[PDB]
Design a protein around this ligand. Sequence first.
Ligand SMILES: [Zn+2]
Ligand SMILES: [Zn+2]
Lengths: 174, 8
Amino acid sequence: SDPCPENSNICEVCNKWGRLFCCDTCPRSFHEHCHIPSVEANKNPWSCIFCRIKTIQERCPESQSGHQESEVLMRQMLPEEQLKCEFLLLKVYCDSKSCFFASEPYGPQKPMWLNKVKTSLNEQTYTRVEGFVQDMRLIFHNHKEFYREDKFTRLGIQVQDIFEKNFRNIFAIQ
Amino acid sequence: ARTKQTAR
Ligand SMILES: [Zn+2]
Ligand SMILES: [Zn+2]
């Protein structure tokens, strides 16, 4: 039978089936380590990061001018900033092409990958928003060479675009 | 958190 019939049969992030956790405030479902932060198995009720971002947004409607990028980057990683960074990281994973940047590469003076950023963010290693944003941009900085197969070049271009669009939407940057 | 097992 379906134990959670009003929640998705498929992970919001990776669009695959399996062992899923089911949000109590929206129909979304997630693998334990696809959600960011990791799902707390014993939290009841549990609201996913989409619902928690929506709550923050509804209680602090944005200004018409928005924010400067440098103002945002200099922010201490207070709980709202941490959550927005987690949601921004998650929106990158939400693209299937993210898997090519998720794992440790097998060149650059500072390799970087999404699972390393996930770990650093979960351990709250970043003390400012800029620490997170800098590591995310390093991933794309490290891939600035034409690939023999153009599709691999276009891949980083598109994931970088996904990051930058979400970064400005989520933090409401000018 | 509620959970379920799904399958393709
Ligand atoms: Zn998943
Ligand atoms: Zn939800």
